[PDB]
Amino acid sequence: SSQIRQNYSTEVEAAVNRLVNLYLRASYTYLSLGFYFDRDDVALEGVCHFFRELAEEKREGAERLLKMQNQRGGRALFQDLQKPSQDEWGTTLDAMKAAIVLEKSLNQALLDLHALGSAQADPHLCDFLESHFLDEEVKLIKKMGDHLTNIQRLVGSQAGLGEYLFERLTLKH
Template identity: 50%
Template sequence: LPGFSRFFYKCSEEERTHALKFIKYQTLRGGRVIFQNIDKPAHDEWGSGLEAMETALALEKSVNQSLLDLHAIASSHQDANLTDFLEHEFLEEQIESIKRLSDYVTNLNRVGAGIGEYLFDRHTLGSDS
């Protein structure tokens, strides 16, 4: 399903850009960036496009919660620069991503597997690229 492939590739590019923003910001603030190993996901194969979208939605919600937790810590330390950075660079975009993925999950549930998923791939995700 080429639409799903393009969609998730585009998402991965966006997440790499976010990582670079954090690296740049931390360096700008005088911090050091220490990289750690990233474990292979527990689930890396999906039986359907719906399952892949549901997994992506859960991951976006998890990232959003982590950003909210970081924002709360920054607020408690009265770090206006970090709270502003998070609000303008990440939090608004996270809500948009969660909304888009939620809509995709809803639509995939409506159209069903097989030809419905194929049409979703072609018409919805095909137009996103």
């Protein structure tokens, strides 16, 4: 409310609500990815685990944003969550390519919000993104890039065998 709100623009407030929506949709996408890899006719437990962990992380990111919205005196507004863009996700390689595209889009939304906060001279918002989101995103994208390279190396050789080995020897399970 007005009682606590200070140096917090309506443009940032709106953008934060949009970013919450994006994080929850990402979470929902990772839920779909995770359960696809648990299907009896896909059955890659390590890949299932990897995406289910990411679903949790994105949900937590949305919750941190909503907490911050309230701390600044903004008002959370929720919209519909669009279903994920695919019902079936292909191979481990297809899925990891989809995941990196998703993360790059989230990262771009984070960078655009930071630019907005810089333009509006809102250092608290800028620091909040820097300290909880931007470094986490860089590290996650690097990890997915490493995974992509290793999957490509393996399935170029021998696709079924390569997919199994990646799940067994790289991913946690």
